[PDB]
């Protein structure tokens, strides 16, 4: 049995030792330490050599090579509005995860940040005055409305090409296919989705129309009717990523559809081997967002022998620390 | 200037008086009282007749549903359909008291499956290992046997066969809302929310319909019978049109996530809902949309500036039946 | 096994049936139903006749007669600022509970409401403007500063008498003794503490000085030095209420010291027989406020065979409903 | 106008840069950055010298502690003393970096008991029955053997005997803070927070000191040796005087409850703290003082209007060591 003991600042300030001490500090600090261990277990399993074949690509319909552990990373839109956008972009840029799952805000806000920035503000700011000045609030963040005007100008010509390619080149569009195209078009190394499509990391977002991107598509469809986005084919693509995995881990930031969609794909292989949740949602109202990992065990979305971890924390604080002690330590092994 | 005072039980248990007294009790009790006022304002507006000019603009809807002076969007998370709030929602839909539903995938199939097999009471603390071993799945403090989903598979597969056939031979262009209407017709059971929704021409939107057991079944089905397409773009036009050509709109949103965002974003298209009540336990401090106060939506134009929206920070399983008792259920005669 | 089913409004509106249906509705509605049952179990045990003696009074040093179940009711100050003040006053007026535990705000705000009201406001109101207008915010409630001026005028002459009685009539003051005296002085049937002292229900508040009452005592002590408030004797009084109980129940609204103090007194009898918590606090930071009842079982503050219930809810909503279906149904049996 | 940008790990793991980048990351990460700025402002003020006039007013304190330009109140709940944050708090107290402590009863005795026997890591989910049967008590995901309290009984009883004797024969008028100072002297262990507090003349206030294991022991003791009095009125004068004759005040408050309220109410006596940082997970919507935003305290005059207080919505076990690393620990040389 391990004793409780916090970091002793009489040693001075060594950050690596400070973070290691979280494991024995208790409460959510201990769960953070447990999360470092689970993610490092995922990474070490991923780095094990493997031997397998063209077969894989025919049943997944993916160009992505299999590894010894397929890592699903899911995150809510607000985290793409935050600086965790840079954290996620880093992992995708270096091919450290295999599948992304977000909400529609979580696609478009990455793209818009390549056109214009998001600013710091305060939770307290009143909507009346903000609206009168053309500013939209996201938590304690602020996005000028003009940001979406620039987004519209950038996007309309691409939508025109997508409709044309659909009606004459046979393209059957889905959200993931669309997200890849937008990342290719934004063509900017600051963008998560630019790196994802370059590295053949698919992005699933079955509610992609539920945001500003949806708005644009709606307005565009009266100037250029025709665009269809199918969600059934994306279901086959994400589920096959899970079924034909050697091992799977889930890193899930926040709740909602991103949490559920990743968990349900792993129910196809009767469960994920590793799982970390980081969110502030609570169980007591029965919502999937607030459920402990152990609920997902009852369903088989996480294997009974797994040691899943939830850290009850704002991921804006915890996720960069987690990456610092896990993925960022093994950068040499990813090149 | 309104003074704080609680209900005095020296008067006896006068239930209506006790509920009315929440308004002056403070904290979330006062917010409940404000939510009752906001929903009654939605209902009073809804029953007001359309002038000639208003009728002209609302008829632009190519939908069969009679247009009213207030189009009410009801959104709820899947857990509430697993709960007994399924019963509350079904009643409102049965009597045409709301006009548009928004939910998540689980929120469709658990209503249908409850017409095949029940959900049971459990405890939050039950461990996943022993439950999984006995083929019981946990939803909060509720429990659903795996057998339930088998029954659902046997029921749904044939319908999936027919939908593919109608897609391919009759030109049907399926969307989530059209599939949900169809599944409601098939279930053909007056205990079902979606049975009543399709009977009463109340559309159901669920852009992430594939993310659950229904998706599992579509996925398996697609291998013995491929090609089913569910387009989300057409549904986006359909929900947005409900908001654009409304004389007035109200939002009643239970929980967070896509249901909260999708309803509010549809109302951005008319420069804001006139009335809105949120009921949920999510907190704002992580910047989630689920935990945002209504005043954030005001920032965006999703709720009008002159509106007086209300958030009640409570589990809807407690609050929503009380809210309905004090609002819609008092005007039942006006809806039949 | 019980099926989930909510109330069917096709029956019309019968509130008693509506509340009963919470038990089968799920999530916190089910826990509410479980709480109704636990409190009704407490009340039914309390109403069982008993046979015992003067002995009791000598080891508790209390005039309160023993019953078959001693009910401890604890609540945080904010609930005395709310209308739950009326709910609590009703239970105390009719001798339905045996021991009260609150914080200091929870004493003085009951007394002040007999001099001037608390008003409705909003959580959003900014402190700068409120302070400039002499208004203090409590959640979405508002208390003018003048309220505390009236309180000061009312209280100073009583403090003078208490110091005099201490230094010449031997009175050894404690918080509970003081709270009884203040309830006697306010002499107003709207006051919780007026009814508590009339019915010999003791009020424990070991941090009584941590509020406006504390302020006043502080200022008074420079005009009239001498007042001592001992907490050791109040410890003996509350613990003996628990030790010499036939059975005990705890109804605890909110967290903090009120939750802990009641639970620790019941650790003296190796546990309470019935227990209901109503609060919105969460466990994940390890605080006693957010702990589930099952933590208290590990300590022996609740008996292993008990079936304690926590309702995760604002007590301003839930407590009047709970009382309506429990204590208020048995009013005839309390007269 | 400050843009949102996160730390770019393409730069490597530069820990100081990563922590500084929280300020522009958003949500609670930005609040952490603001908390670092507020605490560094407290520290910079504290190290500024007292002018002649300022020295004159602060010396009015009849306390031994050297007065500084900023009196810092550190408050924390009992659970944090059970956690490894005990280690963080002890360091600050050891090096005279704070001036007044406020805690709850558990917050005193668990520090002393850790000098007799350790606390262990557990899980939140461990069931109370099997723990009780094996004489293990649960504190969140931490575990304390019952034996710990037996060791504490054997250690404390003799001291209680002496305090009664000094009360009765030497005229000692005991209060919670005086008892805590005495228990710190007795423990005589440099791992103990209260050892260092009494060594450095840092008073500890705990009006509800009786509400826990220490109270249990006082209670039992009072039967073989009655009469111990702990007066809370004198301690009220003592904490209030620390605030009234301060040149400047800062509050660092971890968690809610009496510690939060008592520190803030002491600062009402000077018409407000100049600096304040709250770290806790409590929510405002039930109207609790624990969950109130700092701006509520502004309403009361507990925090000055011109202050820029900060609440970080996080478990302090995560945040507080990071905060200390970026503030107090960078100025260690100035405090020795």
Residue numbers in the entry:
A (entry chain A), C (entry chain A): 28 to 80, 82 to 363
B (entry chain B), D (entry chain B): 28 to 363
Structure paper excerpt:
Hypusination is a unique post-translational modification of the eukaryotic translation factor 5A (eIF5A) that is essential for overcoming ribosome stalling at polyproline sequence stretches. The initial step of hypusination, the formation of deoxyhypusine, is catalyzed by deoxyhypusine synthase (DHS), however, the molecular details of the DHS-mediated reaction remained elusive. Recently, patient-derived variants of DHS and eIF5A have been linked to rare neurodevelopmental disorders.
However, each of the affected individuals has a single copy of the DHSN173S variant. It interacts with the side chain of the neighboring Asn164 and with the Val17 and Lys19 main chains of the ball-and-chain motif. Surprisingly, the melting temperature (Tm) of the DHSN173S variant (64.1 ± 0.6 °C) is comparable with that of the wild-type protein (DHSwt) (62.9 ± 0.1 °C), whereas the Tm-values observed for DHSdel305Y_306I were significantly lower (46.7 ± 0.1 °C). Structural analysis of DHSN173S, therefore, confirms that the mutation does not have a significant impact on overall protein structure but does affect the ball-and-chain motif, and likely also impacts the interaction with eIF5A. However, our data also suggest that the N173S substitution influences the stability and/or mobility of the ball-and-chain motif of DHS. This, in turn, may affect the accessibility of the active site to the substrates, namely spermidine and eIF5A.
